[PDB]
Each structure stands twice: as structure tokens, then as C-alpha cells.
Nucleic acid binder design. Structure first.
Ligand SMILES: [Mg+2]
Ligand SMILES: [Mg+2]
Ligand SMILES: [Mg+2]
Ligand SMILES: [Mg+2]
Ligand SMILES: [Mg+2]
Ligand SMILES: [Mg+2]
Ligand SMILES: [Mg+2]
Ligand SMILES: [Mg+2]
Ligand SMILES: [Mg+2]
Ligand SMILES: [Mg+2]
Ligand SMILES: [Mg+2]
Ligand SMILES: [Mg+2]
Ligand SMILES: [Mg+2]
Ligand SMILES: [Mg+2]
Ligand SMILES: [Mg+2]
Ligand SMILES: [Mg+2]
Ligand SMILES: [Mg+2]
Ligand SMILES: [Mg+2]
Ligand SMILES: [Mg+2]
Ligand SMILES: [Mg+2]
Ligand SMILES: [Mg+2]
Ligand SMILES: [Mg+2]
Ligand SMILES: [Mg+2]
Lengths: 147, 124, 95, 204, 205, 211
RNA sequence: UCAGAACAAGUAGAAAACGUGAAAGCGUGGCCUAUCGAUCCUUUAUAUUUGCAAAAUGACGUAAAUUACUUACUACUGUGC
RNA sequence: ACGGACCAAGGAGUCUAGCAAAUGUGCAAGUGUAUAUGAUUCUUUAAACAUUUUACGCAUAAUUAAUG
RNA sequence: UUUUAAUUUAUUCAUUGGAAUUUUUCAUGUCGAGUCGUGUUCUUUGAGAUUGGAGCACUAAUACGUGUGAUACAUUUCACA
RNA sequence: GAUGUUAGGAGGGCAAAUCCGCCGAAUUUAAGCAUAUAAUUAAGCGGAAGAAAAGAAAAUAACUAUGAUUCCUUUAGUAACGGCGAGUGAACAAGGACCAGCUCAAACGGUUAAUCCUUCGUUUGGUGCAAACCUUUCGACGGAAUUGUCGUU
């Protein structure tokens, strides 16, 4: 709200906070991104390193759909079950959960983190990372490709 | 919660106090019998604690119980793990800085050319 | 990218007929008219030229004809088609 | 069958017989006034394929249009602005010559009528000749007939002047559907406006 | 919002330097008093105001649903607590219980008079009197903009179903009515002050 | 530009003030719409404003799994139902000339839906009393009492909304039924590798077929 | 030099592979202090690295199999960009 | 050096967009109910309430010119 | 007052005409040309060996066709129109 | 083909916020400027309606696939364009509002144009105090039309 704007605090100070010698002029450094690469090079260098120049291949019609793959790490996979069910599973080493990871909105299973030892888990997903697959297997589980 | 558990690992039974919020961790499987004072428990975390047969103490309760903090443990969450903090320090541009530039987005088109690879003048 | 209509799709996201399980479910008058038109109109100058080229007989000549067709009609497909038609016409004439 | 035959004949165009006809016809047209009524379509089949019908209120007008680009209208050749905009002489119009043809008949000469469509007829190097099919929306023969009747509505005044005839549709780029034409559809201008639009939200 | 080109409808331009007059844009021409006058610019009579107000100012604010809910809950709690209610300004000294709950017979009251009587019986006679007193004509220019009277805010009757309450308490000054389902924080905490005096039906409760 | 901030990207170099629409009309507009729909409903005494739509699977690899209401039922599905397109249109059901069926299962589902709809619906006679059987698809016209009874009951709008997900995502499996030897990553990568050549052969196969 | 950015020019190394010397060593140009150049574009090198967006192009390659839309398995797969 | 004869009133860091930091607040591996719907919602009500008996954003993972 | 829902009563007799599905025969038809397209020019586009448009030159194919499948091309699939 | 003060009709001008066509700048930004930008904007010229335009796929996808247009939320400040500088910048999908499909041409019907219109009429009705309206089917006399009307899909 206007009442707690700085300008209201500078009300009777002559220069309105923008300094007496170096005035407040309109667009002194140029307009917008302006002299990046000339008089504002240094700022660009120090805060915006890779800004100028282009790189890599064009990709003329992207379609972000084609390439959509939300990921989850195996660590989080057991979290995807409710507490009580999880407890039950822990109790019965004799029976394992299948987890349709796609149903919960993730396509790739990546392999960050530990899985509970021995507790076997069946994972249904579209993509697995080598390591994630290895983790699952080591635990006595299966990775089942779905589509 | 996981972090709390880790911190409690060596000395059990004594009461972890945390001046902030404690969040739950889906990445934990098992929860030990924890006695924790905090400013806030996210609901799920609280529920988990309850299930563990633990105790969620507020600060007043803690004070009542342990006014000199006997058998307590102050803990902090990860402070400089904040995403804002990743833009601080030496500016990206200064060499050997691991500061994220403020950029619209990620992808080759955005801040990945001159001064980011030996091929386009220089690096960093 | 590619699939096959025979066989169900391998239950995989990527690769050949990758995808889900699901079981798949699948003149004379004109000729006469054309003839009439031919009788009426004959051919157009470019067509005539092409025919002549074809008659010349060799591979080089054929190539030349094709080139001409491309130049006139635009596009290699159309030109090819035209050439084929002309060849057919020539054959017919020869009979 | 007859109409099929004449379609096929007219496809040939550069073939001797057709060529001769075209030569005669264009010559004849060169002589007549720029826009003038004709009693019967010169290409009945083609007219039919568009909108033409032998109902009382339907009329054909033969119209001649100069070929070529239109010099950028400026006092003397000189243009006063930046070099990008400086050229005259290779300035091609957004409208088709067909559109122009229909425009000139529709507008001041036959303001009473409604332009339905137009077809090609002939050309020389100086002129292109079109026949434009028009209709009298007040003739009851047209008012009553439920197919066609539509043109009697007031929303169809001067279709030719709003680029709503086939030629108009062409140069607005509504003939091409798809990804090739995404940027023009409700109208190019309209689309542009939409894209510019800043929607705020009272709540925000 | 000010109309778009307010103060800028003129053709005015500045005469520039060599006339011994400030270089504010001037109205051109002659004959009028307006000729030669300072034209647009915040300083000038007939000028445009500075940053003219625009319809695209942010008028509303999104508030987090959860936050709103929390606020509502807190207001309810406040309404509960006697001291808070008292602070908020109500003459509640003669009411026994401040989570004040009343039988469903209230929801069927047909007549404002009856409602008033009921209120009096409850102990809110004083409150009612205060409400009656405190219709006064506003200070300032509100008077000119259909905000003529200023009225203090009385109890809030919360009801489960309208079989008469809406209509009967309508017309008692400062008395407001809300369905339990659709509680409005604007009514529960007028001027953002906690602890309005709420009268609940038992069903509502 | 100064200091360490995002490089500014504000597309306001055109006369943007000319086309700012502020939506002061939102809630009121919504209310108006609601009113209009109510009016429409009233006009169609008893009958539902809403039209039957088939459930369909969304395209593209990312919405693949989800299901939502398409426009219109496909000739084949109508046929299955035992229904003419025109007739269907006349009732509350949408028809889609351009939609096609690849999946038997999908087709079955939509015909099931159609059947359900048919079962649900009771037809008011065209000219009063005179109860006659329909045309092609449409059911028979019920008598008066039945109609009255139906009216007295609530008009169900459960069918016009899409069927929500079946759920699963957690399912028990016996440990002895797991196949511990099935390299899934290997399968993937191998498949990826082999794609081009399988493509090379499919084309050949196609060519062969074409003669 | 300095923002302790760049380029440039150096100093110190490491991994290769060599030269010289009997060797220890010395050699990443000139005994040392100058002799020089971003983005974009072009250009020609490099590569069991990729792409051209529904696919394919070395190659029906190698095995089987039967005439057919057959089943496996291959680091090497058109021009142009 | 310039401006100021006097007096009264008017008279100049504002508003939006998007980003950031700071701080408050909520909830927290989530968060924001976006359009839109619904209500026994209808002076105020253009707010408030509600969210159907896996929407999208940002975040939760990075990195590569790229197949990945 | 405006209209538009529900509710109330239709029942006899005439016959021209049409419609939908359903069998079973036979028909494999027709499907928009100075138009599409290519070249070239200018414009316009985010459209990139040209997105649309236009001028000019050249000027097609018949559904097994021709047009899209965002890199110019050829040889050919496939999908969609 | 001209010609008619022939009989009957139509257009013209005003108004414009939204709308549709053309036509078309420059200030401005780039700290200069020339391509770019401003902007397919302002002005100019023409044309409609209560909305206009668009619209029933020579569409998108590469899926388990969707299915006219429009609009909103988004995709996305993304793909892309650009003295690759300044800056510009969509589309598909997804979620909604709303949802409506169609008829010419061509094919077919010659044991017959079945069509269509002008003028003149004729006689049942309905509301109105009148004024007017509303419909009802029936012929004539004209023409139009085989260079193609109507039905069938
Ligand atoms: Mg000071
Ligand atoms: Mg000053
Ligand atoms: Mg100075
Ligand atoms: Mg121009
Ligand atoms: Mg004023
Ligand atoms: Mg005052
Ligand atoms: Mg002096
Ligand atoms: Mg001075
Ligand atoms: Mg003085
Ligand atoms: Mg003065
Ligand atoms: Mg903050
Ligand atoms: Mg066609
Ligand atoms: Mg441009
Ligand atoms: Mg595509
Ligand atoms: Mg006019
Ligand atoms: Mg400048
Ligand atoms: Mg300047
Ligand atoms: Mg200058
Ligand atoms: Mg204008
Ligand atoms: Mg329209
Ligand atoms: Mg949009
Ligand atoms: Mg984004
Ligand atoms: Mg632009």
C-alpha cells in the first residue's frame, strides 16, 4: 500500500532519493537489455555467463508430449504405499506389492537411494535406469515393462 | 523425519528439539519410538510419529518437562540447502563458482554458450 | 515409430510395434471419356516433344525427356508420371 | 456425362482446339466493355460447379482485370521512409486478380446483386478475364428456393468486399487448413488481437 | 478509473523558449481564455492527473483457500471466548454462555418483533438498544455515495435452515445472518476484528 | 540492466494498453450462464440438456493412460447398440462420422455404455398417449403412469459424466511367482537398438504384400 | 594486466608418444621482458559421438524356415544439411 | 551564476506485467482449485462458500548439441 | 401482459406418399483445373534450402489418384485426410 | 445486343465500440544505424451484424490414439525466428464453456420438367373495435427452363 512506500518517506527530501548530482533521468543506460556486449558487457559476463551465442541442433517441431517422462527414485517407491499396507508388507516377507508407477503419474524409475533389504517389490513402469533395475533385482523384486 | 531419526541414532530416549517445522519422509520405511519437540509438525509427519508410538511435544510442553533442557538435543534443518542460497556466493562468471544463474529456463538456448564452454570464447 | 497390423504390440514403451496389449480390429466410362478427349484435342506441345524424345529410343533420350517433364510440370513425381503416360501412349501407337 | 466431357476438354487448355477457342474468346472480350453482362455462362459446367443455377435471379458478368503488380501509390516514385519499405514496382497485392474482378463488378456496378463466385474464362498478357456469378436476392424465385435462399440474407451484402467469396477465402489463407494456417483462422487480424490480449483476472 | 484521454483531448503544443513563458504545452489559437494556457501535464488546470487510475489495477487478492479456512476457524473460536467478544465491543455482560446456543424453534420465527423479544429475553436488550442508537449519518463524502448511515455490528445468527430466521432478523439494525455451511469471514470478523457475538441454532452447532 | 537478476523478457513493446481485458465479469458471467442453462432445462421439460458422449483414450504418449469424453459415438458402436445414427442424434446421443475403432475392447466398452444409456432412458410419446415403438434404434414409448413415476423420481446425470479410474496401483503378488531373471533395462536398450532394422524389414514385408 | 572476468602471454605440473644425451637430465618453440583478437558467420579437420521429428536406404547381411506381412541375430546403413 | 513581484489553490517515483531478494502468513514432497461447475448463492453477493458419488503450473533430478 | 414447460381427451374411418433398419440380388460408380503444384520475384510468418499470400512463367494427376506427416533431394513404405 | 419516365423491384447516404477486407507509415527500441523493432499497429479506402468472422477436416497424432469452428485455462515466454543483437514467438496435446450439423456439383430418374416464377384470381379459416395480419389449396393466362429445374444420395 502507498502509505508504506519509500517515496512517501522521502517526501520533503529534494531529490526523492535518486541523488542530487547524478540525477534521475529516463533510460540513461539504454533501454532494456540494451548494451549487453558493449557498455554492459561486464554485468552480462559476471551474472549471465552463457548468454550470447548459440549452440547445438535446432529441433524444429518439439512436441514436449513425445518426450515427457516424469521420474521417481526407488527410495520413494515404498513411500507410494499407505502406512498400514506398508506395515503389512513388512510383516509378510511371503508376499510382495506390485506398484503401477504409471498409475501414480510417473513413467521412468530412476535409482536414487536404498530400498528395504529382502523386502521384494514388483515395479511396473515404462522406463527403468540400469541402476534402478539392478537395485530392484538385488532386493528380489522384478521390473516389468508396461506401456 | 529421516534426518531427525539419523540425529537421534546414537543417543536414544532423550528428546530432540527443533525450533522449526518437521516434515515427513516418504523415503523412510521404519520409524523408531521418537520423542520430539518442534514448533510445527506437518500433519502426516505427526501421524507417522503417533504410529511409531512416539510423542509430538510443543515448546510449552518441553519447557514444562525440561526447563533447563536436560536430556535435550537442539537440531537444525538444512539451512543453506535453500534454492535461493544457490544463487549466492561468488557470481557465475567468477571462475570455480557453483552459483546458479537466474535464468528464464533450462535448455541449450539459455545461458549455455559464450563463457560457458571453451568452444565459445571462454568458460564459466 | 513403426508398427505392424498383424501381431499384438510388445508390452514395451519403445522399439518396434511397442505399445499396449490391445487386440486390433481392422472404370470403362472414364476410359471412354479419355479416348474421346484424345480424339478431340490430341496433345499439347510439351507432350508432343516428350513423345518425340521417347521415340528417339535410347536411355539418354529418356533421361532428357524426364528432365523436360520436370522443368515443365514441376516436381519429379509428376514428371515421372507424365513420362510413364507418354511411354504407354507410344506403346499403344506401336500396336 | 456432357458436363464431364466439357470438363475434360477444358482441362486441356493448351491443346489445339481449346487453344483456338481461347484465342477467339479472349480477343472478343478485349473488345467488350471491362465489366459487362453476358446472357449465358461461357463455361456452363464450371458455373454449375460453383453456385450457378438457371433460376431467374442468377446472372453472369464478364469482367476484365489488368495483369501484374500494382506500383506502390506515392507522389512520384519516391517513398520517404526506411529502406526496407522503399521499393515500389515489385509490390504484389494481397488480393487475387480474381478477387479484384469480382470486387469491381460487385461494388458500384451491381450493388443490388450478391456476388456468389467467379471462374477463369480466359487470359492475355494485358488482361485476365473472369465470369462472375451474381444473384438478385430480391427476385422471389431466389427468395423462395430454400437452397440458395441464404444469399438473400443481409449478412451477405458485398461478400466480395470482405473476402468471403472463394477467392477471398484463398488469400485470407482459409483454403489451407492445418498447421500451415494456424495463425489465420477466425481471421488473421482477429487471431493477432487474441494473441496480443493480456487477460488479467479481477482476483489475480 | 479516469476516462482514458482525460486532459489530453487538446491539440496543445509548447511555444518553446523565446517567448518569456515557461515551456509547458499551450493551447493554440485565440479568442478564448483557454488560448495560450498550460494544457496537459499534472501541473496544469485542465491537465491530466499524474498516473491516471486504470481499470487494470489489481482489485482483488487471491487468498489461499487453506488460509481462509484457518481464519474462519479462528473467528469461530473467538466467537466462542467471552472476553474476546467483550473486547470486540458487544454488551454481553448479561449473557450466561458465550458459545450461545438456542433451540431450533428460532429457525421458524416469522416476525421481527418476536425475534427482538427473544433477543431481549436472552440478555441482549442492551446490545439491541446500542444498535438502535448507533445509526448515524457518516462523516465526509460517503454521504454523497449511498453510504449515508453508519451502523454498528450486532450479533450474528447462525442457522442450519431458513424456516423464518432470514426474514425475521432482516430489519433489526446490525443483525446478520449466515448459513452454517457457508460461513463468511467478512461477517464473522468485521473490520478484521476477532470475536463477533454469534448466536447458534443447536442444529447449526 | 543492473545487478544479478533474470534477464528481462517483458513483451510490452507494442501498444499493449489497447488490448487489456480485465475480467470483472467473471462470477456474474458464470451466474448468467447458469441461469441460461436452467432456462434451457426448463424448456426441455424433464429431458436433460446434456448429451451422451463416448469415453475415449486421449492421444499422445503422456495422456495415453487417461480416459475422457470424446464427441460422438462412431457408426460401428451405434450398430452394436442396435441404433441408427439419425435416431441416435434425435435422442440424447452424439454421433461422430470421422471417429474410427482400432480396439475391439474400446468398442465393446462404448457399446456397453450405450446399452446402459438405453436401459436408463424412457421415451415420452411424440403425440400424447399414442404409444408406438421406435425407428431403427429408439426404444418404445411408455404409458402415462410410468412416465409420471419417472418424473417424480430424480433425473440421473451420472452417465453423462465420465467413469472414473478403476484404481489398482497396489496389488499383492506371491514371491514364488516372481521371475528373478528378466533384464528390463537390457530389454529396453536392445529394443531401441533393433528398431531401425525391424523397420527395414517391415517395409520389405509391406512391399511383398503389395504384390 | 585485473572485476582478482576474458583474451593474450607465461610459470608449474600430469597423461600420451617421441627427440637428444653415455647418463643424470633437458625439450609443450625463440636466454627473459612485446610481436596480437569475442559472439555470429564461413572453412576444413576429428569421432565404434549424434540428429533431420511416422518409417526405411550398408543388406532381405548372416543363420534358420517355406513361399508367407515367417523367426532369430548383427558397433560399422543414401545424397545433402 | 541562474529561478523567485506577491498570495491562494492545483502541482511530480505512480500503476500493471514478469523476476528476484527481504520479511510476514499458510501448507509442506508437495503446493496453488486454473478455467469451469455446484449450491436452500443472490440489497450487500461482481463476495463468500463448495470441488464433483492422474487438468496445468512451479517444485520433487540432473546432464547432454543430440538418439538420450 | 409476454411465452413455455408440465398436466387434461381423444376416438372412429379413407388413402395416396414417404422414411429407417433388415434380408437378398448387382453397381464398383462419382468425388470441384490456368486449379493444385513447381520455378521465380515481392510480401508475411516463429516457419528455419520459404508459413501463408500475391504477381509472372510453366502447368498436373484421377482415388492403386493428390495432399499433409515443420531440412533440400531421390527410391519406397506407412498413417491421416 | 441496344432501347424504354414500359410493369414490378434493388443499390447509393448516415452511424462504428466490437467486426470483415484491403491499403499502409513513421516516431520509437537497438544507448549510433541500415536488417530487425515499432507493426501485419496509426492514419487512408471499402463492407457487415446484434454480434461479425470461423466452421463440419486434402485436421492432429505416432497414442491403448483423437475428431467442425469459436472462446477461456494452459501448452509457453517453450519450439522457433533474430546485425542469433535489440527483441519477436506460435502449434499439438491436456482441462473446460458450448456443442449441430449440412447441400450444391458430380452418379442415378426421359412411359415425357415432376420444377420455378409474374400478373389475374377463387374460398375455407384464425385473432383484431377497426387498420392490418395470419394462414388454407385451387386453377387459369403468361413466361423462365433441355446451354438443366426438381426428386434420389
Ligand atoms: Mg538527507
Ligand atoms: Mg535535482
Ligand atoms: Mg556526473
Ligand atoms: Mg504493401
Ligand atoms: Mg480533467
Ligand atoms: Mg471533510
Ligand atoms: Mg548572467
Ligand atoms: Mg543554467
Ligand atoms: Mg527574475
Ligand atoms: Mg514564477
Ligand atoms: Mg518469500
Ligand atoms: Mg475432391
Ligand atoms: Mg516481418
Ligand atoms: Mg505432425
Ligand atoms: Mg454504403
Ligand atoms: Mg535509436
Ligand atoms: Mg538514445
Ligand atoms: Mg538518430
Ligand atoms: Mg484504421
Ligand atoms: Mg456468419
Ligand atoms: Mg490459446
Ligand atoms: Mg512455464
Ligand atoms: Mg511481430
Amino acid at each position: 500500500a502507498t502509505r508504506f512506500k519509500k517515496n512517501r518517506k522521502k517526501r520533503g527530501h529534494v531529490s526523492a532519493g535518486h541523488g542530487r548530482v547524478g540525477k534521475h533521468r529516463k533510460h540513461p543506460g539504454g533501454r532494456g537489455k540494451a548494451g549487453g556486449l558493449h557498455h554492459m558487457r561486464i554485468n552480462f559476463d559476471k551474472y549471465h555467463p552463457g548468454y550470447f551465442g548459440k549452440v547445438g541442433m535446432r529441433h524444429l517441431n518439439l512436441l514436449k508430449n513425445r518426450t515427457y517422462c516424469p521420474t521417481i527414485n526407488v527410495d520413494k517407491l515404498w513411500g507410494l504405499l499407505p502406512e498400514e499396507k506398508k506395515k503389512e508388507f513388512s510383516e509378510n516377507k511371503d508376499i510382495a506389492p506390485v506398484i503401477d508407477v504409471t498409475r501414480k503419474g510417473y513413467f521412468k524409475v530412476l535409482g536414487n537411494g536404498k530400498l528395504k533389504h529382502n523386502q521384494p517389490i514388483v515395479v511396473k513402469a515404462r522406463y527403468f535406469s540400469s541402476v534402478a533395475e539392478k537395485k530392484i533385482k538385488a532386493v528380489g523384486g522384478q521390473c516389468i515393462l508396461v506401456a | 523425519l529421516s534426518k531427525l531419526q539419523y540425529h537421534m541414532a546414537n543417543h536414544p530416549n532423550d528428546i530432540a528439539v527443533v525450533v522449526g517445522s518437521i516434515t515427513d519422509d516418504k523415503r523412510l520405511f521404519s520409524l523408531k519410538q521418537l520423542k520430539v519437540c518442534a514448533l510445527r509438525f506437518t500433519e502426516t509427519a505427526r501421524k507417522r510419529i503417533e504410529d511409531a508410538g512416539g510423542e509430538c511435544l510443543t515448546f510449552d510442553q518441553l519447557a514444562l518437562k525440561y526447563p533447563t533442557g536436560k536430556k535435550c538435543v537442539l537440531l537444525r534443518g538444512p539451512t543453506k540447502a535453500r534454492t535461493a542460497e544457490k544463487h549466492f556466493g561468488k557470481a557465475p562468471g567468477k571462475p570455480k563458482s557453483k552459483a546458479r544463474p537466474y535464468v528464464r529456463s533450462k535448455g541449450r538456448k539459455f545461458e549455455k554458450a559464450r563463457g560457458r564452454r571453451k568452444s565459445r570464447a571462454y568458460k564459466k | 515409430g513403426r508398427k505392424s497390423t498383424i501381431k499384438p504390440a510388445t508390452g514395451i514403451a519403445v522399439g518396434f510395434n511397442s505399445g499396449h496389449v490391445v487386440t486390433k480390429r481392422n472404370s470403362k466410362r472414364k476410359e471412354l471419356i479419355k479416348d474421346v478427349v484424345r480424339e478431340i484435342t490430341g496433345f499439347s506441345p510439351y507432350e508432343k516433344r516428350i513423345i518425340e524424345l521417347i521415340k528417339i529410343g535410347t536411355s539418354a533420350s529418356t533421361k532428357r525427356s524426364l528432365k523436360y517433364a520436370k522443368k515443365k510440370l514441376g516436381t519429379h513425381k509428376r514428371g515421372k508420371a507424365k513420362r510413364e503416360e507418354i511411354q504407354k501412349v507410344v506403346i499403344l501407337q506401336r500396336r | 456425362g456432357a458436363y464431364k466431357y466439357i470438363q475434360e476438354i477444358w482441362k486441356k487448355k493448351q491443346s489445339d482446339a481449346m487453344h483456338f477457342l481461347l484465342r477467339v474468346r479472349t480477343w472478343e472480350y478485349r473488345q467488350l466493355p471491362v465489366v459487362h453482362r453476358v446472357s449465358k455462362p461461357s463455361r456452363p459446367d464450371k458455373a454449375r460447379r460453383l453456385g450457378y443455377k438457371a433460376i431467374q435471379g442468377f446472372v453472369i458478368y464478364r469482367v476484365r482485370v489488368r495483369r501484374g503488380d500494382r506500383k506502390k501509390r506515392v507522389k512520384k516514385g519516391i517513398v520517404h521512409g526506411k529502406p526496407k519499405h522503399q521499393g515500389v514496382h515489385k509490390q504484389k497485392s494481397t488480393r487475387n486478380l480474381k478477387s479484384v474482378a469480382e470486387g469491381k463488378v460487385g461494388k458500384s456496378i451491381c450493388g443490388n446483386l450478391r456476388v456468389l463466385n467467379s471462374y477463369w474464362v480466359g487470359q492475355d498478357a494485358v488482361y485476365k478475364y473472369y465470369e462472375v456469378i451474381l444473384v438478385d436476392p430480391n427476385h422471389n424465385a431466389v427468395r423462395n428456393n430454400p437452397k440458395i435462399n441464404w444469399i438473400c440474407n443481409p449478412v451477405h451484402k458485398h461478400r466480395e468486399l470482405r473476402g468471403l467469396t472463394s477467392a477471398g477465402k484463398k488469400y485470407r489463407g482459409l483454403r489451407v487448413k492445418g498447421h500451415l494456417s494456424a495463425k489465420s483462422r477466425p481471421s488473421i487480424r482477429a487471431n493477432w488481437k487474441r494473441r496480443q490480449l493480456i487477460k488479467l483476472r479481477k482476483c489475480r | 478509473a479516469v476516462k482514458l484521454g482525460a486532459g489530453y483531448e487538446t491539440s496543445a503544443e509548447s511555444w518553446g523558449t523565446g517567448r518569456a513563458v515557461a515551456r509547458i504545452p499551450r493551447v493554440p489559437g485565440g479568442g478564448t481564455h483557454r488560448a495560450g494556457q498550460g494544457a496537459f501535464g499534472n501541473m496544469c488546470r485542465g491537465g491530466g492527473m499524474f498516473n491516471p487510475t486504470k481499470i487494470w489495477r489489481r482489485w482483488g487478492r487471491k487468498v489461499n483457500l487453506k488460509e481462509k479456512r484457518y481464519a474462519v476457524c479462528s473467528s469461530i473460536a473467538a466467537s466462542g471466548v467471552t472476553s474476546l467478544v467483550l473486547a470486540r465491543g458487544h454488551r454481553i455482560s448479561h449473557l450466561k454462555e458465550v458459545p450461545l446456543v438456542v433451540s431450533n424453534d428460532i429457525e421458524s420465527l416469522s416476525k421481527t418483533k418476536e425475534a427482538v423479544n427473544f433477543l431481549v429475553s436472552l440478555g441482549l436488550k442492551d446490545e439491541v438498544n446500542r444498535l438502535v442508537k448507533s445509526k448515524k449519518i457518516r462523516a465526509g463524502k460517503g454521504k454523497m455515495r449511498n453510504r449515508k448511515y453508519k451502523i454498528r455490528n450486532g450479533p450474528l445468527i447462525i442457522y442450519e435452515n431458513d424456516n423464518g430466521v432470514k426474514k425475521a432478523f432482516r430489519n433489526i439494525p446490525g443483525v446478520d445472518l449466515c448459513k452454517v455451511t457457508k460461513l463468511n469471514l467478512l461477517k464473522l470478523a468485521p473490520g478484521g476484528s476477532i470475536g463477533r457475538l454469534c448466536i447458534w441454532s443447536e442444529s447449526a452447532f | 540492466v543492473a545487478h544479478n537478476n533474470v534477464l528481462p523478457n517483458v513483451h510490452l513493446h507494442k501498444w499493449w494498453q489497447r488490448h487489456v481485458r480485465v475480467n470483472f465479469s467473471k462470477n456474474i458471467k458464470k451466474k448468467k450462464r447458469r441461469l441460461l442453462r436452467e432456462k434451457r432445462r426448463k424448456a426441455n421439460g424433464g429431458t436433460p440438456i446434456e448429451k451422451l458422449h463416448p469415453i475415449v483414450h486421449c492421444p499422445t504418449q503422456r495422456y495415453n493412460f487417461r480416459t475422457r469424453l470424446g464427441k460422438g459415438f462412431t457408426f460401428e458402436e451405434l450398430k452394436g447398440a442396435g441404433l441408427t445414427p439419425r435416431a441416435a442424434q434425435t435422442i440424447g446421443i452424439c454421433y461422430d462420422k470421422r471417429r474410427k475403432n482400432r480396439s475391439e475392447e474400446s468398442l465393446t466398452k462404448n457399446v456397453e455404455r450405450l446399452l446402459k444409456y438405453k436401459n436408463s432412458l424412457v421415451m415420452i410419446p411424440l403425440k400424447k398417449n399414442k404409444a408406438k415403438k421406435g425407428i431403427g434404434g429408439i426404444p418404445a414409448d411408455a404409458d402415462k403412469n410410468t412416465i409420471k413415476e419417472f418424473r417424480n423420481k430424480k433425473p440421473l446425470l451420472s452417465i453423462f459424466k465420465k467413469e472414473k479410474n478403476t484404481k489398482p496401483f497396489y496389488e499383492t503378488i506371491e514371491v514364488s511367482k516372481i521371475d528373478k531373471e528378466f533384464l528390463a533395462y537390457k530389454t529396453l536398450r536392445r529394443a531401441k537398438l533393433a528398431e531401425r532394422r525391424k523397420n527395414r524389414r517391415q517395409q520389405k514385408k509391406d512391399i511383398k504384400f503389395k504384390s
